[PDB]
């Protein structure tokens, strides 16, 4: 969960390499996408749709061992100055569209980085972040320009706990090569395997390696029960100054008028030449 | 003012330098009917370079080619200098559009037979121009010394190491040292602002002299 | 004026035409009809488009370089997408360098390899146009794959 | 136009606008007449 | 993307109208 990312990496959810810390314990990889507008106006509430696509029918092994649905979660690192719009700034339509989803700033003064989740992925395939663009006219620390919006979204159960202990939603591996040749269910769905080989397997995964045979060094003993995954999507958003667009429109209109006048002057000169040849 | 109409304080210049000669030489050229809009592409390429010659010029007044000040200088241009955002964005966009207009110009030249005899040397000089512009953008992509430019150069500069004999020597020569760093930034800035502008100016002069001497190619 | 017909009665002009040159001696006059009135149209158009792209899509600043943390996805400028792709998919790095450098050196031989025929129209150059179309498609395919993982870079996601 | 990603849309718009610019140039040529 | 189409059509119409107006009103006063 994203608060485990707040605990593991309390400074930033992103490393200098660009990887989100979510992938440290979310070993799988999937698709995550964000629909950020190319350009936005200052002090304007706009929706950022984070879509976390996965098959709703597909079910993952739960924490106990049974199958179950998938919960979705995301971290959206909006540019410095952006923030989730307070419920008062949202319009009625946007307020109804976002729903009762709860967002967190992930840190003090880092309200641009917003985490959400876990949320039931059956209905939260897309999460609408009501982002509020800053106002560089008031905020002297914010400038208009093109900035990077990073997104890290996960939909399955993590493979590694914050203490490093693996979860049941992964394929387990033998430490070395040996003839373990023993399977015994520990009074539950989770069986245990017992040269000297000590491998424990919870109720999550399913066995593929038969008993009473040679196991090589580090082979997949169990099925990989993970059906979700974590995906990143680095995109761009332009904090646009409307005055720039106004003067751009004026300048381009002037250019078009100048081109029209150039063609008219060429027509006049062609008319003059057509009579100078008629000598 | 059309070509020359009633210029009479102009008798001084014509008496000393005989500039009516170049006036008549320019006015003695004709544009054939087969010249369509696609023949404007090469000039547009030149147009883009002129913009790159100007805006890049401007960015030489505020950019500091040092690994401890390059990125800070670029963000100072974007955030503090008046219209520095505009100058830098125009520079990047006109670089991209220079290369695009170059590709379209090559498409026009090839699809109109403009490279055939007697215009083989024009095509050779054009290919050298294309190489100059590609390496121009290569050297300039890391001047901001951000993650993208630095790592793109660290990737493309260690490539010559595959050559067995002079591999590592070439890698060191391009990087200005054994590893990508301050020497690489200084050498790339010198290439971007001094070496390659002069190289492309000479190549453009050769290109345009050949074109003017031989004129445009025949109809299709 | 409107148009100047080629004076075929001129010996020098006919000699130039036989040599492939001398085509700038007929048609519409270059000055001021095209150089003074048509060139500024294109120059202003290019400047306006570039300024509009700059204002509506500025250049981003980025993040400062870290020699210890390579980014997840590193890419050169778009026009280097094909050649970069070669570097990605050729396991022989020397062969990758040879293939990347064979583009500028391979283009310098175009006017000499295709010196077999005087024809300039594409519809009179079947082999040359087949090669050109195949090469343009291959370059576009390599450039498109450069924005893909090295696994599905040859199929573009099929 | 205030979209999110302009790769496919940008290409289609660029093609359409090039064709429309040529068409409108010819339309103005037709609509300018010959001599009043 | 939708009202942009309307702005495009209006912008083209305005500039074509002023182009034709300038052409005909300058040929009318014999300026061109």
């Amino acid at each position: 969960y994203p608060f485990w990312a707040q605990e593991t990496a309390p400074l930033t959810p992103r490393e200098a390499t660009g990887r989100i810390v979510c992938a440290n314990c979310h070993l799988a990889q999937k698709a995550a996408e964000v629909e950020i507008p190319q350009a936005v106006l200052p002090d304007t509430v706009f929706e950022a749709v984070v879509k976390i696509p996965y098959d709703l029918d597909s079910q993952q092994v739960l924490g106990d061992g049974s199958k179950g649905g998938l919960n979705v979660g995301a971290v959206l690192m909006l540019p410095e100055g952006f923030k989730i719009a307070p419920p008062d700034r949202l319009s009625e339509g946007l307020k109804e569209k976002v729903g009762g989803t709860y967002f967190q700033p992930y840190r003090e003064d880092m309200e641009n980085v917003v985490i959400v989740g876990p949320l039931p992925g059956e209905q939260y395939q897309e999460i609408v972040f009501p982002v509020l663009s800053p106002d560089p006219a008031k905020d002297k620390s914010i400038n208009y320009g093109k900035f990077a919006v990073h997104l890290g979204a996960n939909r399955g159960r993590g493979q590694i706990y914050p203490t490093g202990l693996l979860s049941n939603n992964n394929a387990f591996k033998a430490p070395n090569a040996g003839t373990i040749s023993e399977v015994n269910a520990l009074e539950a769905g989770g069986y245990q395997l017992i040269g000297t080989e000590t491998v424990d397997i919870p109720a999550g995964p399913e066995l593929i390696v038969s008993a009473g045979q040679t196991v090589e060094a580090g082979e997949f003993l169990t099925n990989n029960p993970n059906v979700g995954g974590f995906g990143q999507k680095d995109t761009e958003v332009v904090l646009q100054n409307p005055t720039r667009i106004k003067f751009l429109v004026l300048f381009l209109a002037g250019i078009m008028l100048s081109q029209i006048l150039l063609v008219l002057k060429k027509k006049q000169i062609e008319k003059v030449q057509a009579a100078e040849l008629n000598f | 003012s059309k070509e020359v109409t009633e210029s009479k304080v102009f008798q001084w210049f014509n008496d000393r330098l005989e500039v009516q000669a170049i006036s008549d030489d320019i006015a003695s050229k004709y544009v054939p009917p087969h010249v369509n809009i696609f023949y404007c592409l090469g000039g547009l390429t030149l147009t883009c370079f002129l913009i790159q010659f100007a805006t890049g010029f401007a960015m030489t007044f505020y950019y500091k080619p040092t690994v401890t000040e390059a990125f800070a200088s670029v963000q100072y241009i974007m955030n503090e200098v008046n219209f520095g955002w505009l100058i830098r964005s125009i520079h990047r966009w006109s670089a991209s559009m220079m290369v695009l207009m170059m590709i379209l110009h090559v498409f026009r030249v090839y699809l109109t037979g403009g490279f055939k005899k007697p215009r083989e040397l024009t095509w050779v000089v054009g290919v050298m121009l294309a190489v100059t512009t590609v390496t121009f953008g290569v050297t300039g992509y890391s001047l901001p010394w951000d993650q993208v430019g630095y790592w793109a150069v660290k990737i493309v500069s260690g490539v010559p190491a595959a050559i067995p004999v002079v591999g590592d020597q070439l890698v060191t020569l391009m990087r200005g040292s054994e590893s990508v760093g301050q020497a690489t930034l200084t050498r790339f800035y010198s290439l971007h602002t001094f070496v390659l502008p002069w190289a492309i100016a000479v190549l453009l002069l050769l290109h345009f002299l050949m074109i003017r001497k031989q004129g445009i190619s025949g109809p299709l | 004026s409107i148009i100047k017909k080629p004076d075929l009665s001129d010996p020098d002009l006919r000699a130039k035409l036989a040599k492939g040159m001398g085509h700038n001696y007929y048609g519409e006059p270059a000055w001021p009809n095209d150089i003074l009135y048509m060139f500024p149209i294109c120059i202003l158009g290019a400047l306006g488009l570039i300024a509009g792209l700059a204002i509506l899509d500025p250049a981003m600043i980025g993040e400062p370089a870290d020699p210890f943390a390579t980014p997840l996805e590193i890419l050169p400028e778009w026009y280097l997408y094909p050649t970069f792709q070669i570097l990605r998919i050729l396991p022989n790095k020397l062969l990758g360098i040879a293939g990347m450098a064979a583009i500028p050196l391979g283009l310098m031989l175009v006017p000499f390899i295709e010196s077999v025929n005087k024809f300039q129209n594409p519809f009179r150059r079947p082999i040359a146009m087949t090669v050109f179309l195949f090469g343009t498609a291959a370059a576009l395919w390599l450039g498109a794959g450069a924005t893909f993982p090295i696994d599905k870079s040859l199929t573009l996601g099929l | 136009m205030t979209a999110e990603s302009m790769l496919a849309n940008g290409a289609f718009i660029m093609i359409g606008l090039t064709l429309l610019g040529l068409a409108w140039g010819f339309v103005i040529i037709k609509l300018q007449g010959s001599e009043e | 993307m939708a009202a942009g189409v309307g702005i495009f059509i209006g912008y083209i119409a305005v500039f074509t109208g002023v182009t034709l107006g300038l052409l005909y009103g300058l040929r009318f006063v014999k300026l061109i």
Binding site: - | - | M38, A46, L56 | - | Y11
Partner: peptide, 29 residues
Amino acid sequence: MDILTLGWVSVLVLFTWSISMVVWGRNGF
């Protein structure tokens, strides 16, 4: 209406109009 749309349309119409003016001024393509 919109202003971002206005700027994008302005640039697009400038491209289209530059092509149109080059075609009209040279009397054909």
